Amino acid sequence: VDREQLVQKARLAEQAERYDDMAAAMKNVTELNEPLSNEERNLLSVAYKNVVGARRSSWRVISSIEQKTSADGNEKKIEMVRAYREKIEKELEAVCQDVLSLLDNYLIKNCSETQYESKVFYLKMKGDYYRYLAEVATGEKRATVVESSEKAYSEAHEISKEHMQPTHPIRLGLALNYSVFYYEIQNAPEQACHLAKTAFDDAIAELDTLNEDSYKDSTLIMQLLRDNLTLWTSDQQDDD
């Protein structure tokens, strides 16, 4: 099938809310070993987010059940619930492993040294999916992926801070997710709030640099950054 029909399936699959087919189409596109366009990058990211996202939601529903029922004291149920949790974990870990491969074997590799915008995005993406693994890992396994998530974000942070305007949506989107990694995984609210507030403050400072093609994209992420800082600062006051 022509490359253009693949992308057209992705668009269609998205509209039909069939993200498994959408992700499969973009995987093929990625494996043709040509660089992805801006729209294509969006399709890839949205496809696998929805796929992996459905598992995260289910896993959280099930892991939640596992804490409420563990008190009842019926071992027949506790076993099967734990078993179902494992089933979903395996699925989630498989999807992540699939994306991470596409990133390391095709996307990040074919990026030259002047494609900062694409490299930051893929690296930001790489950090996101190692983090998904961290949400369901424990012991040394969790330690390994968290280290990998850090390395991905950290590098993306440096490139974006050096080559991208603070108002750039990719740079903003990185600060957002990277700050989440701190608060949720690393449990470092100070590092989270600081990174988010700064990323937001720097965008207001140079707010005149919004380009019309994507001003609406940058403004959206900025709201999310503030919605986070509001939510986070209210959690610290309950714990205290």
């Binding site: 729209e39 990211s45 949205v46 989107g173 957002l176 997710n177 093609d213 994209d217």
Partner: peptide, 13 residues
């Protein structure tokens, strides 16, 4: 469990 807001969309046009 309590997630914060996130984002995953490259600028189209």
């Amino acid at each position: 469990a309590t997630p914060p807001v996130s984002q995953a969309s490259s600028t189209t046009t």
